[PDB]
Design a protein around this ligand. Structure first.
Ligand code: YNW
Ligand code: ZN
Length: 347
């Protein structure tokens, strides 16, 4: 029954208008940061990933936790795959020559000046209270007492996607081969890794908005009441389930390695698995949500969740997340699934 799930989604939809007040605080902070960085020798080509978006909201339950990405175009960029990990690379070749450790581009040396300039500007204006938190790659600010913003620096490359993505983004049977070709013409991004190296991880997070806003096999999906689907609602419930489970056990360390990214990745694998819009009918919200929960548990038990763009990078590998952590999450979700999800009728 979709009765409980809709009420959860209705409760979630209410706190959306709280974001409008908090986001405005975030814009003023990052508008001041972008102008201070743009007149630095290394960060002349800095800017937001999306010119007006200004954020991404990882916490679908807490409207006070934002995630912001700054971009920096690195032209004539040469990448070396680090030990066949398929996702971590060295950047070698200039405004960025001050961070060169010989041939390769140092991530922590670029993060040092980036964190330094922000640290100096955060205190400089301080017409509104912004507090810097140091702890790994993200420069985490806190506006007033509630709002927290994660600022991530990313390198932008407008060349072809690296070979490891050749069989990724398997959307041909769902969104068509024409759309996959158009998406792969868009740039790709590299973010600091933070074992240990001066390597960068391939990032394709900017592709999520492109697909979430155009998500059906039918081009008119969710444009009229006759073909309203529940794809977005299922993703929201999947993200909220993990956030509640991570909140419920915040005094332990078992669920610290799982994020909405894993929940996103498994969901889009389900979208590949179920390409027809009829498989996502709104009347079947409870059933479709179960398909997502089932697949994610199958991933947890099998210790396998492929990067959606890099099929050879296992997000659930033992190097990344240990077996006891994945078994702990498996038990909690299976318990919630058997019990009609008690984490949903509370907060
Ligand atoms: C079709 C498609 C399109 C895009 C994506 C996608 C790719 C990446 C990536 O890094 O490649 C990525 N990262 C993130 N971070 C979110 C986060 C930030 C802070 C804390 C916790 C989570 N969300 C992402 C989504 C996927 Cl899974 C499917
Ligand atoms: Zn739809």
């Amino acid at each position: 029954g979709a009765s409980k799930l809709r009420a959860v989604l209705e409760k979630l939809k209410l706190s959306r208008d709280d974001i409008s007040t908090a986001a405005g605080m975030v814009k003023g902070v990052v508008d001041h940061l972008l102008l201070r960085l743009k007149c630095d020798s290394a960060f002349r080509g800095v800017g937001l990933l999306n010119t007006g978006s200004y954020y991404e909201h990882v916490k679908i339950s807490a409207p006070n936790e934002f995630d912001v990405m700054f971009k920096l175009e690195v032209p004539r960029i040469q990448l070396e795959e680090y030990s066949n990990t398929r996702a971590y690379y060295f950047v070698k070749f200039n405004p960025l020559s001050q961070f060169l450790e010989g041939e390769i581009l140092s991530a922590s040396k670029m993060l040092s000046k980036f964190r330094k300039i922000i640290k100096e500007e955060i205190n400089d204006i301080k017409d509104t209270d912004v507090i810097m938190k140091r702890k790994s790659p993200a420069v985490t600010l806190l506006i007033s007492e509630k709002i927290s913003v994660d600022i991530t620096l990313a390198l932008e490359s407008k060349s072809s996607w690296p070979a490891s993505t050749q069989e990724g983004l398997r959307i041909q049977n769902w969104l068509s081969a024409k759309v996959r070709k158009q998406l792969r013409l868009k740039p790709f991004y590299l973010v600091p890794k933070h074992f240990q190296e001066e390597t960068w991880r391939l990032s394709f997070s900017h592709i999520e908005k492109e697909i979430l806003n155009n998500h059906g096999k039918s081009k008119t999906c969710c444009e009229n009441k006759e073909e309203k689907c529940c794809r977005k609602d299922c993703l929201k419930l999947m993200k909220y389930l993990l956030e509640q489970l991570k909140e419920r056990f915040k005094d332990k360390k078992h669920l610290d390695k799982f994020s909405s990214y894993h929940v996103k990745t498994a969901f889009f694998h389900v979208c590949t698995q179920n390409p027809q819009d009829s498989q996502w009918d709104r009347k079947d919200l409870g059933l479709c949500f179960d398909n997502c929960v089932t697949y994610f548990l199958q991933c947890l038990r099998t210790e396998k969740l492929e990067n959606y763009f890099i099929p050879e990078f296992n997000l659930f590998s033992s190097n990344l997340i240990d077996k006891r952590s994945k078994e702990f999450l498996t038990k909690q979700i299976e318990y919630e699934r058997n019990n009609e999800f008690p984490v949903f009728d509370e907060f």
